[PDB]
């Protein structure tokens, strides 16, 4: 019902959102992530962050491990809800840092397609 995005996709990384609005806060979108990796090898430490803007609020969730495995066997899941007081359309900036191929990789991404329905 609110269409799920590809946030991210880039090195091999993907990561998806998928939303929900919440049942207790109609205010609130729950986002779910999922990060997988196409590649041959995992990304370690992996760290997802976000920010938005100025008028909503952000609760990033534990995830639900800190290595994307490679040949997309699983994913990282990470639920960050976002909390939109002013029906403003979202907007996030995210930040990914991860290790792979024993390299540090960082990347700052804005991810400027949410769907209409993730924050109408
Ligand atoms: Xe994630
Ligand atoms: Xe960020």
């Not at 049942?23 to 997802?48: G, K, R, W, Y």
């Not at 994307?68 to 899941?77: D, L």
């Amino acid at each position: 019902m609110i269409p799920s995005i590809t946030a991210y996709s880039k090195n091999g990384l993907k990561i998806e959102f998928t939303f929900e609005r919440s049942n207790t806060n109609p205010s609130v979108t729950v986002i779910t992530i999922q990060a997988s990796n196409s590649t041959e090898l995992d990304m370690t430490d992996f760290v997802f962050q976000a920010a938005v803007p100025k008028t909503f609020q952000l609760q990033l969730l534990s995830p639900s491990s800190s290595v994307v495995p490679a040949f997309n066997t699983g994913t990282i899941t990470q639920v960050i809800k976002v909390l939109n007081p002013q029906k403003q359309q979202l907007r996030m900036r995210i930040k990914l840092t991860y290790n792979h191929k024993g390299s540090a990789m960082q990347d700052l991404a804005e991810v400027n397609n949410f769907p209409p329905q993730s924050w109408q």
